[PDB]
Write a protein that binds this ligand. Sequence first.
Ligand SMILES: NC(=O)c1ccc[n+]([C@@H]2O[C@H](COP(=O)([O-])OP(=O)(O)OC[C@H]3O[C@@H](n4cnc5c(N)ncnc54)[C@H](OP(=O)(O)O)[C@@H]3O)[C@@H](O)[C@H]2O)c1
Ligand SMILES: NC(=O)c1ccc[n+]([C@@H]2O[C@H](COP(=O)([O-])OP(=O)(O)OC[C@H]3O[C@@H](n4cnc5c(N)ncnc54)[C@H](OP(=O)(O)O)[C@@H]3O)[C@@H](O)[C@H]2O)c1
Ligand SMILES: CC(C)(Oc1ccc(F)cc1Cl)C(=O)N[C@@H]1[C@@H]2C[C@@H]3C[C@H]1C[C@@](S(C)(=O)=O)(C3)C2
Ligand SMILES: CC(C)(Oc1ccc(F)cc1Cl)C(=O)N[C@@H]1[C@@H]2C[C@@H]3C[C@H]1C[C@@](S(C)(=O)=O)(C3)C2
Ligand code: NI
Ligand code: NI
Ligand code: NI
Ligand code: NI
Lengths: 275, 275
Amino acid sequence: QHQHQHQHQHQQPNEEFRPEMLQGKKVIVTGASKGIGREMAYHLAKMGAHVVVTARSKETLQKVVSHCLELGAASAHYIAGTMEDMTFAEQFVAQAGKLMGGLDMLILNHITNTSLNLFHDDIHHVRKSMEVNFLSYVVLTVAALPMLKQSNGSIVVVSSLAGKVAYPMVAAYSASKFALDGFFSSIRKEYSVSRVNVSITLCVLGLIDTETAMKAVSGIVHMQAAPKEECALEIIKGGALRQEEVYYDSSLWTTLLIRNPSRKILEFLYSTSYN
Amino acid sequence: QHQHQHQHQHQQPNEEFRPEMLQGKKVIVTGASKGIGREMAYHLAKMGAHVVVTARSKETLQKVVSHCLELGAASAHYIAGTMEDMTFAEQFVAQAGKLMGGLDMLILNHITNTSLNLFHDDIHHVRKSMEVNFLSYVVLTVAALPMLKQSNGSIVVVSSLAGKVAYPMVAAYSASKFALDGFFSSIRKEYSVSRVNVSITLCVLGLIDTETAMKAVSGIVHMQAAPKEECALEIIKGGALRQEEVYYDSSLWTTLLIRNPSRKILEFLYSTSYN
Ligand SMILES: NC(=O)c1ccc[n+]([C@@H]2O[C@H](COP(=O)([O-])OP(=O)(O)OC[C@H]3O[C@@H](n4cnc5c(N)ncnc54)[C@H](OP(=O)(O)O)[C@@H]3O)[C@@H](O)[C@H]2O)c1
Ligand SMILES: NC(=O)c1ccc[n+]([C@@H]2O[C@H](COP(=O)([O-])OP(=O)(O)OC[C@H]3O[C@@H](n4cnc5c(N)ncnc54)[C@H](OP(=O)(O)O)[C@@H]3O)[C@@H](O)[C@H]2O)c1
Ligand SMILES: CC(C)(Oc1ccc(F)cc1Cl)C(=O)N[C@@H]1[C@@H]2C[C@@H]3C[C@H]1C[C@@](S(C)(=O)=O)(C3)C2
Ligand SMILES: CC(C)(Oc1ccc(F)cc1Cl)C(=O)N[C@@H]1[C@@H]2C[C@@H]3C[C@H]1C[C@@](S(C)(=O)=O)(C3)C2
Ligand code: NI
Ligand code: NI
Ligand code: NI
Ligand code: NI
């Protein structure tokens, strides 16, 4: 109905973010029982999206779903399961899309539990890292793609500074996050040439103040953590705007130094050869 | 005995490559039945190294082993098996080190069979890519590390331009090669702080004229391929000199553009904070 005539607007030749870009949109959020995943569920609810949230803990997901509905979600549902289970991953998306009658955005956020430790002999954690953090994202993507091709939708992949540069104590985790870049940046190029109108947003996040991260770094690293609330909002904005990469960190020097113009230029040369 | 007094030498304040750096050294080469792996076996034989070569095809490995001995290898052995089998991977190294009485260099070269195709639905190839191309390298590394800690030896990891930048048609392969960078660059940092004197050399190679690559790219990509013989030699030189990364490509613009000074600087800042 009413407007707010005192609220400022900017002048342009073009485009910004508005919540209406998510109003009535059909969105899956994975790892949504806590942290950034949960915050993203909430933001999307407030924007009047349809949300399907997932994670292992059904009891906490019930709470998220309940709060989503309170905040103004168009609809809110959960399906419980582990992303170690590739059959679940595949069935979760089909079930999520039937609930909503479609899919506009796939937000891939979950990771297997990880701590800061030097590597020796924990091959299982390495495999489990690759399966949960990387392989399930590929399985979810494959299941989701027919629906996303219909809606010209978006895949949002949550990664890390440790998915662009190296760090000790997180080798397995870092390997999986690098793998995400390798894989999705490659299919992004494939979609460009096969005219698949599905955007891919890789999100490169510095340290975020979730309980899990703050516990993991206690006494080992002494650094600023960015607020989980806005981090979650920035992820959604990047995906909604169909941006290839999103950067979010407490430090602006860091966000400066994770860009790779050489790689952009090398890839630009390969595709100008193709063009 | 004799010298060659007409052969030139350079002036310095320090260091170059000499074959003697491999004389009597104990070296594992994986994927050594053909291509770059086989060429590396040969180079090492000529330098009078002890070699243990592996791959699935025992009949071709017998030939490699035979030619290695002819070229002047200190000793030459093969152990056949698939790197899909993590128990084999682990047992191969123990068996290889017993054969040689130690280990100076682990050369990780093998990949699972891959072709140029757009990605859809081949989740098995993606998993198999991660297991063979990435996971087995971690298992081999873990098995090998006690021996390498003894000899202050070296791990040489064969990667690709598709392990530093993105390319269509090789998403699964690219994901695994990115994973290698993530993982080994991280443990390199860990070894630095835990005073583990084992070098890690990540090799970033452009297109090489092996039969397998040349078949894979026929009619799809029209580019120069560098000779497999020298590529193999450059890999060995980089590892012997304990260099963190090696670049080899037909094009010098390409080798210019795969360096990432931003990443070096970001990591340099993290370790100056630690220092
Ligand atoms: N926080 C940071 O400082 C930081 C920095 C860089 C990147 N990131 C990235 O941001 C994302 C979220 O981070 P966060 O700190 O908010 O993590 P978090 O709070 O620990 O949440 C992880 C979520 O994934 C779910 N999950 C864990 N294992 C699962 C499994 N096997 N199958 C299905 N779901 C599983 C968890 O729910 P259940 O346990 O109930 O299953 C939880 O909801 C991750 O991708 C992370 O790598 C975070
Ligand atoms: N050639 C290029 O243009 C190029 C470019 C960039 C990077 N590279 C990298 O260079 C390395 C070698 O390349 P290449 O072209 O010389 O490859 P290649 O000729 O096809 O050799 C691959 C080797 O790995 C072995 N292998 C395959 N599957 C295996 C398995 N499951 N278990 C154990 N061994 C297995 C093969 O022997 P069996 O079949 O008998 O097992 C073979 O000896 C690879 O790491 C590749 O990614 C190559
Ligand atoms: C930005 C990074 C690189 O922060 C660091 C980590 C380690 C360092 F050495 C330095 C830094 Cl800056 C990062 O991604 N950290 C996360 C964080 C803390 C740990 C490790 C990583 C996974 C989690 S998780 C998902 O909750 O399992 C656990 C959450
Ligand atoms: C340098 C790269 C990126 O060359 C390209 C590949 C695809 C492109 F689109 C462009 C370019 Cl430049 C590269 O690594 N190619 C190899 C080569 C050819 C194919 C794919 C890759 C694995 C093999 S293999 C190991 O023998 O399975 C098969 C051998
Ligand atoms: Ni109002
Ligand atoms: Ni404004
Ligand atoms: Ni002579
Ligand atoms: Ni000279």
